[model samples]
Target: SHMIGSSPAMQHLLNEIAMVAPSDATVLIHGDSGTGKELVARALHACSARSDRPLVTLNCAALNESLLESELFGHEKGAFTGADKRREGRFVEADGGTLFLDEIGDISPLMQVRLLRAIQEREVQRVGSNQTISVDVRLIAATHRDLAEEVSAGRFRQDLYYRLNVVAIEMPSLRQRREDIPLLADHFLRRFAERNRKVVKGFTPQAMDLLIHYDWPGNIRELENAIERAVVLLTGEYISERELPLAIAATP
Candidate 1:
C-alpha cells in the first residue's frame, strides 16, 4: 500500500489526499516531526496531474538564507564567488511538476518575501540575473511548527502563510492513532525480516502489547526503527519483548 494504515485517522487522511490530489491547489501539511509530512507531500504529487513529472523537494531548515535563496530560485554564473555555473533552482526544476518545501516555518523574513513573490507571480529570477523565468509548479509545503501561532506572534508572514495554506492537511501523531501501530509494526517487521534474511514471522503478543501501548514520540519512524532492530536481532520465529528497545519493552 502507498500508505500503511487502517485506522480512522489514516482513512480520513487518505480521503483528504484523494480529494485534493486532482487539483492544482497549494497544500500546507502541518504535523509534528516524524509524522510523515514528506510522505503526504509525495502522495499528493503522485496523485496529481503532474505525477509523470518531477517532484523536487528541499528542506528549508537545512540551509541558510543565501543558500536557500539560490536553491529555490537558482543562480547565474558568477552570482557569488562559489557560483561558477548557471544552476536551476527547485522552482525551475519542478516546473510543470510539484515543488515540496519542507520546514517552511523556519525560513527568514527575507526568504519569505522571495518565496511569496515567486508563488504570487508564478515566476522567479535567478540570482544576479534580471531575467524572469516563468514556472508552473504545484507547491506543497510542510512544517512541524504551529504556523498560525507563528503568524499571530509575528514570526511567520501571514500573507505567505495564507498563500501556501490554501489547503491544509494535519497529520495525526502516532499516539493519536495507536490502532495503526500493529499494522505499521508488522509492515516494518516483514520488510526488515526479508532484508535481514531472517525467518521471523511476527511479534509476540507481549511485544505487540508493548508496541501498541508505548508512546512513540518519533511517530512511525521510531516504530519502524524498533521493528527493524528487532528483526535484525531475532533468533526465533517471532519477535519478543526482549528484542524490543528498552523504552518500548519496559512500557507498563
Candidate 2:
C-alpha cells in the first residue's frame, strides 16, 4: 500500500475502503486498467480483521480455462497428467483471509458456475476430488470491464455478478483527478530516485505542467513509469521535458 493521492476522488475511494474493509461481504472493484484496483483490494485486506492472515491474489485472465480451474480449486495427486502432488487452491489458501481475484470479468461461463457454487456453499471440491473443503474467505474481485454491461450483453452470468457485487467500489482514472498528478509524480520521483541512487531534486515546472495537462490513458501506472524513466535519465538536479517520453513531452 503505497496508494498516494489527496484528490476528492481518491478520498472518496479511501473512505469506501475504510467503510467496507470490516465486513465479510464480497466486494467488486470496477476501474480501468492501471487505476490501482489491486492496491484498493490490498488496502481493504490490510485494514480488515483478517489482516494477520494471508492476502491471496490471482489474475483470472492470465490462464486458460483448465489451468484456471486447477489453480483456483487445486488438484489431487495424480489428478491430471501434470499433477505430481496434492495442492491447495487459492480458496483454501485464503481461508480466513482475503482472496483478490483480478480480471474476474474474463473468466469463462463454466468458471462462473463453479465460482458461484464455491461462493454460495463456502466450500470447494478440488480437481478430480469429490471431498469438499470448507473455507471462510472474503473475496475482493476486480475487473477493467463493466460487468453490468457484460451481464446486459449476456456475456457474464447475472447470478455470479450479484454474488460478487455485494459492495462495489469504483476507481477514478488519473485524468479525472488532474490535481493529483503533481503529488503522484513527486512520489514516484522520490521512490525511483532513491532506488536508482539518483540525486534528482524534482521535476522542472514545464515537466510538471506537461504531466498535469496530458490525458493519461494508462492512468497512474503510466505516470509512475514515466517518472521512473525520468529519474533514471536525469543528469541534473531537476528533471525536464528532455527526460519525458514523446507522448507526454509532446503533449499540446
Candidate 2: segments with Cα more than 4 A from true spot: none
- CA lDDT of each candidate? 0.86, 0.86
Clashing pairs in 1: none
TM-score of each: 0.93, 0.93
lDDT of residue 148 for candidate 1: 90
Clashing pairs in 2: none
What value of lDDT does candidate 1 attain over all alpha carbons?
Answer: 0.86
- Cα error, residue 96 of model 2, in Å, equals 0.6
Could you tell me the TM-score of candidate 2?
A: 0.93
Per-residue lDDT, model 1, residue 244, is 86
